[PDB]
Design a protein around this ligand. Structure first.
Ligand SMILES: [Zn+2]
Ligand SMILES: [Zn+2]
Ligand SMILES: [Zn+2]
Lengths: 48, 65, 1103
DNA sequence: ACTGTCTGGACTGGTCGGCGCTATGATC
DNA sequence: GATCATATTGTCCAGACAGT
């Protein structure tokens, strides 16, 4: 159940499996806060 | 945070001429004459252009992803 | 030379606000606490002596490092406020205190061991954001306009509201009319302990002394004898030498002549404190009580006991003079006698308590280690022995918890509150907030009302409503709070200036007494000359500006007061000599050019800070053109007497005081771009205005405050007119086209948190989509927005009870439980963001921020800046709205009945100014007392081609005909409030009930019911509706059936297994009846039975 | 029989929203 | 390391009560 995540500071893609994660962080810059990327499935928003 | 497209009272488009108005204001000219030459005659559209403050540039710096 | 203009004074005030800021009291107090307060507490504690023969540990210097956090793995990394907020971490820094073991009297090598983590104030000297530019703060995810001055505890911002307490170690005298006595009280402070020492004189002329933990007031002469004075003459001149005072003292010791020695008075004190005890036990108890309770601020050693008697004498005079008319009763609400405990003092007290408990814990730890291991292991390595016997968390969990729940040691509560993040105004108001220790339900007529000493220190209008009125205030814009300075230097300076010490010369009627921070230090021959010399030295920069000198020259008594302590709220005033202010045009030019700063102006004595005590000797001039030879000071900015939210009101002098109070209170409830980093913030609730606008009629202070950069409202074209009765009773009518065009559009963000908590035995939560086979499955469609990791996808539309984070819990005492975090049933929106991180224990934490678009509708609260508020009554289409001859359709319509009833002329002036500003393009100044005059505004409105009154010829939107009256239409700044109808609608038919009373739950978050209170029952009884009351209170809330035994009235027991109903106390398997009643009544019967009360229900036939 | 003193109880209702807490020093 | 018994004992009004 691994998934891709976006780092809060550097913004690069971070790949890890939250089910069996001993520790979740961005290895590129050491940041411990990650953002879930927006899905590419098209969403429809009513104009006002 | 961004200039509204239309005036809230009559729907007159003002976002096109807002940046020109802001640039002319920063040059030291009287904003009333700037609004006059830009076709902004009704004071409701003048209200929309004058009272608006740009803040989107300070929100873009905080990335969300 | 010209007499100056208010624009120059405004420039000076702007420089003052730029140099210091608006949260200076918190930052300065925290810096003072960090620099020496920890060291003062450590030196006060001194050393720890455990149960080890011939060994002790003394404390050295204590320092604080950079804010850092240690993860579960063990990695120490720098900590930032944004990371602390997101990851629910406490923004704290380690405290390192060196420990020097002492073996056989020989000092050993110092050991530096961390003693805990102290929370760090935002933007303080110990914070990582100190000295950073706007770009650096932006790169760290921090708003450059954020003032700081608060604490982050467990990811939640905590602000310490200042406390308006009495002046410590100061005697205040008053007369009780009901008791017919003169009472003087002093709150002596020692190491965070407060003792209320009281001296009273009843109608009989005797003097009584009230000491805490003493059940009865004992005579003043008895304590005076037990304090060290033996003979009557000692008590005779320990107070004064005035013949009336001497004769009162003679009467006192004649009445109290039954006790002549110290032992008898101590025996009396011990007997009153502990009756029925041996004589020596009472003696030592009384000695300890006198040492640790009778004026602890003078010390605890018996050596200073005699000096305490002197402090008693100065009390007695204060009691005697008011009893004889020599002196008047001082005001308890006067700010000269009132101090302001800031965050630094409360932090010092909390750190003292935590450090004392840590010291006792370390003493127990070393005692246990020495008793277990022995002398061989203890003294083989004294560096490791001391370090291993320390539990830092024991300290830390006492500090941050007091900063979490707001409860302080000593019974003080509500010290720390959640920081208000509704908009830019609310946070500043909370950071400049002052509370009072008085109870909210108490009617405090003399305390809640505004005082004359609040000018320039307390905002006169911005106060809350209800029970919080008066007791909760806000600091004025020009209010300045003093910082602590070494009192020994001030005392030495006073002594060297010519003040004879008290121990050298006795007080005389012809001599001026000199008081330092409420403590008499001596007498001088010429008090006025000394006061003038001190003021001249302060103006010359020789001494610090913290010292304030005042002279009280009455016909009976003469005194000189010098104050250099904390908690004194002061205001800046321009010094005027010989009718000429010290501030000239050259100083203003230097301020404008940047060569001169506010601190430079303070240094030369041109502008000085005055507290309430010194201002009693000052004669202030309101305006620069009103200065005379007798004037001593000039007001800098009369508009600066208001608070930060109160300055938002344009032309507050043209509005009623309750209207100004309502407008100031509602300025914090408005919605707008308060913070630029709102999207990355993890606030549990937040609001955003889509198109915020700076008001066209705004005070000049709002530009300096920062409200123009962070607006919280929009300018509305409001026409005052009656429209179909839908604007009636404070209601407003909004334009449908304006709403559809984005006017007053707002977005509401709610943040939910889910933690993968770990339980005992290795059990932990799992982030995954729950299987349908497990119990507690909400439904198949509720997890449709979840990903394979159990987290909701961003930009996903959600509804009520929609699953955001799929969490599974281990079963209690079977399949795994369901503990998924869901949206509120009455709330919806779109998922804005999802954040995955870890907590302080290393467990996973997912924060989901969901945004909902809030288009204005009926019931949405909109308020003007002048206290005019109301909900939307109708969404009128643009074609139905009236329009003026100039082609302007109002964006809002208000009832004309509300304008004159509430005496709101400032709203009309603001409408005129907004129309003028829109037509001319130049913003209209709305500052108090220096704003653009109304007549000038009408003049330019006439010159612009419009009517002077602002009335315009309007045509009806439905009939199309011209209205017979010219309608007043103008631009008024109207702000949308957070009291939206979307978050306020509640509707419950049936659902969850309380486990105790079997009644509907509380609030709206858990689908609770609506309370039918006692008053509703009373009015239902008055209506005569018996069956309606039965249906409401009983048939719809807690209806139940019970079995009652007819023989004894006890509640019978029904056994389903046996299938039979019988009375256990009585038997009676036949005569049992079913009775319908409320479950609350059954609970009451159970409570009565538990209270050893037997209720016997005598049953009666229904017919 | 009066008089000041000690002791006891209550301090309008309702609602929205949040924050935070409810173990530990021995024992094998 | 994993467990386990214990974990301290603000005002005002009205009624009852020693004192003179
Ligand atoms: Zn990264
Ligand atoms: Zn318009
Ligand atoms: Zn029975």
């Amino acid at each position: 159940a691994t998934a891709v995540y976006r780092c809060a500071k550097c913004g690069k893609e971070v790949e890890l499996d939250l089910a069996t994660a001993r520790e979740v962080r961005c290895p590129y810059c050491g940041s411990k806060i990650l953002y879930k990327p927006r899905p590419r499935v098209a969403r429809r928003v009513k104009a006002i | 945070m961004i200039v509204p497209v239309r005036c809230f009272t009559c729907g007159k488009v003002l976002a096109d001429k807002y940046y020109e108005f802001k640039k002319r204001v920063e040059a030291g000219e009287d904003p009333g004459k700037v609004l006059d030459d830009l076709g902004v005659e009704r004071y409701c559209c003048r209200r929309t252009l004058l009272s608006h403050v740009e803040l989107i540039d300070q929100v873009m710096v905080y990335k969300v992803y | 030379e010209p007499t100056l203009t208010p624009d120059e004074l405004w420039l000076v005030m702007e420089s003052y606000w730029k140099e210091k800021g608006f949260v200076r009291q918190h930052l300065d107090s925290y810096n003072a606490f960090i620099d020496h307060g920890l060291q003062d507490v450590v030196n006060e504690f001194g050393e720890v002596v455990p149960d080890i023969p011939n060994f002790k540990v003394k404390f050295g210097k204590i320092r604080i490092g950079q804010p850092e956090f240690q993860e579960a793995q063990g990695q120490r990394r720098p900590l930032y406020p944004m990371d602390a907020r997101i990851r629910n971490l406490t923004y704290s820094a380690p405290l390192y205190l060196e420990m020097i073991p002492v073996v056989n009297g020989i000092e050993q090598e110092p050991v530096e061991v961390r003693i805990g983590e102290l929370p760090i104030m935002l933007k303080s000297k110990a914070c990582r954001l100190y000295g950073l530019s706007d770009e650096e703060l932006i790169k760290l995810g921090e708003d450059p306009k954020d003032p700081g001055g608060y604490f982050i505890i467990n990811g939640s911002e905590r602000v310490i509201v200042s406390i308006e307490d009495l002046a410590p170690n100061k005697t205040l005298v008053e007369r009780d009319e009901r008791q017919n006595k003169v009472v003087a009280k002093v709150f002596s402070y020692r190491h965070g302990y407060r003792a209320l020492i009281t001296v009273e004189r009843k109608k009989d002329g005797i003097l009584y002394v009230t000491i805490p933990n003493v059940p009865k007031p004992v005579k003043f002469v008895y304590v005076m004898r037990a304090l060290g004075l033996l003979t009557d003459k000692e008590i005779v001149e320990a107070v004064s030498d005035d013949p009336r005072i001497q004769q009162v003292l003679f009467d006192n010791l004649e009445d109290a002549s039954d006790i002549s020695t110290q032992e008898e008075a101590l025996d009396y004190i011990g007997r009153l404190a502990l009756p029925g005890q041996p004589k020596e036990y009472r003696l030592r108890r009384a000695e300890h009580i006198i040492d640790n309770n009778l004026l602890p601020h003078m010390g605890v050693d018996p050596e200073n006991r005699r000096a305490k008697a002197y402090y008693l004498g100065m009390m007695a005079l204060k009691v005697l003079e008011l009893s004889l008319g020599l002196r008047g009763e001082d005001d308890k609400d006067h700010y000269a006698n009132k101090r302001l405990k800031l965050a630094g003092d409360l932090l010092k007290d909390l750190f003292r308590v935590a450090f004392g408990q840590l010291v006792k814990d370390m003493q127990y730890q070393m005692t246990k280690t020495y008793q277990r291991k022995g002398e061989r292991y203890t003294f083989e390595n004294i560096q490791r022995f001391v370090r291993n016997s320390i539990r830092p968390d024991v300290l830390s969990e006492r500090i941050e918890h007091a900063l979490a729940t707001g409860s302080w040691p000593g019974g003080r509560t509500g010290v720390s509150q959640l920081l208000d993040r509704t908009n830019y105004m609310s946070t500043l108001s909370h950071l400049r907030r002052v509370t009072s220790p008085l109870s909210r339900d108490q009617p405090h007529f003399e305390a809640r009302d505004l005082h004359g000493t609040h000018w320039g220190r307390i905002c006169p209008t911005e106060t809350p409503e209800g029970p919080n009125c008066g007791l909760v205030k806000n600091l004025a814009l020009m209010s300045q709070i003093t910082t602590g300075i070494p009192e020994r230097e001030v005392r030495e300076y006073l002594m060297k200036m010519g003040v004879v010490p008290i121990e050298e010369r006795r007080p005389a009627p012809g001599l001026y007494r000199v008081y330092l921070n409420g403590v008499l230090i001596g007498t001088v021959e010429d008090g006025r000359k000394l006061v003038e010399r001190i003021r001249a030295d302060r103006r010359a920069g020789k001494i610090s500006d913290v010292i304030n000198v005042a002279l009280y020259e009455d016909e009976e008594v003469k005194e000189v007061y010098i104050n250099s302590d904390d908690g004194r709220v002061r205001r800046p005033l321009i010094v005027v000599e010989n009718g000429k202010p010290k501030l000239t045009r050259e100083h203003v030019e230097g301020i404008k050019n940047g060569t001169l700063t506010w601190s430079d102006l303070i240094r030369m004595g041109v502008i000085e800070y005055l507290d309430a005590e010194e201002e009693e000797n000052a004669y202030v001039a309101t305006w620069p053109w009103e200065v005379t030879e007798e004037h001593t000071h000039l007001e800098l900015m009369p508009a600066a007497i208001l608070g930060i939210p109160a300055s938002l009101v344009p032309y507050p002098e043209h509005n009623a005081a309750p209207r100004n109070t309502y407008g100031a209170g509602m300025a914090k409830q408005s919605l707008g771009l308060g913070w630029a980093n709102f999207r990355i913030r993890v606030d549990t609730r937040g609001h955003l205005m889509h198109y915020p606008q700076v008001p066209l009629v705004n005070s000049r202070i709002m530009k300096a405050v920062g409200f123009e950069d962070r607006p919280a409202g929009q300018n509305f074209v409001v026409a005052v007119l009656s429209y179909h009765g839908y604007n009636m009773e404070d209601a407003v009518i909004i334009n449908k086209a304006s709403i559809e065009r984005g006017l007053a559009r707002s977005t509401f963000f709610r943040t939910y948190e889910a933690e993968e908590k770990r339980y005992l035995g290795g059990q932990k939560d799992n982030f995954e989509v729950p299987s349908p086979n497990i119990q507690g499955y909400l439904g198949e469609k509720y997890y449709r927005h979840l990903d394979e990791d159990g987290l909701i996808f961003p930009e996903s539309k959600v509804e009520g009870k929609d699953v955001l984070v799929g969490r599974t819990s281990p079963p209690r005492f079977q399949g795994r439980r369901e503990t998924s975090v869901t949206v509120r049933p009455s709330e919806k929106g779109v998922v804005d963001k999802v954040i995955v991180t870890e907590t302080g224990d290393g467990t996973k934490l997912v924060k989901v921020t969901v945004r909902d678009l809030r288009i204005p509708e009926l019931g949405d609260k909109f308020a003007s800046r002048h206290g005019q508020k109301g909900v939307i009554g109708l969404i009128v289409p643009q074609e139905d709205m009236p329009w003026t001859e100039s082609g302007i359709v109002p964006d809002l319509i208000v009832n004309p009945h509300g304008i004159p009833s509430r005496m709101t002329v400032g709203q009309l002036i603001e409408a005129i100014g907004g129309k003028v500003a829109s037509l001319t393009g130049r913003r209209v100044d709305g500052t108090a007392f220096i704003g653009e005059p109304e007549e000038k505004l009408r003049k330019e409105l006439e010159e612009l081609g419009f009517k002077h009154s602002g009335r315009e010829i309007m045509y009806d939107g439905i009939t199309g005909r011209r209205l017979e009256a010219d309608i007043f239409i103008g631009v008024i700044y109207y702000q949308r409030l957070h009291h939206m109808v979307a978050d306020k609608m509640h509707a419950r038919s049936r659902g969850p009930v309380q486990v105790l009373t079997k009644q509907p739950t509380e609030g709206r978050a858990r689908e609770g019911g609506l309370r039918f209170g006692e008053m509703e029952r009373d009015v239902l009884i008055g209506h005569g509706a018996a069956m309606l009351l039965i249906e409401r209170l009983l048939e719809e809330s807690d209806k139940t059936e019970v079995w009652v035994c007819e023989s004894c009235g006890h509640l019978a027991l029904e056994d389903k297994r046996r299938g039979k109903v019988y009375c256990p106390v009585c038997g009676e398997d036949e005569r049992i009846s079913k009775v319908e009643m409320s479950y609350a009544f059954k609970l009451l019967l159970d409570e009565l039975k538990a209270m050893v009360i037997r209720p016997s229900l005598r049953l009666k036939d229904r017919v």
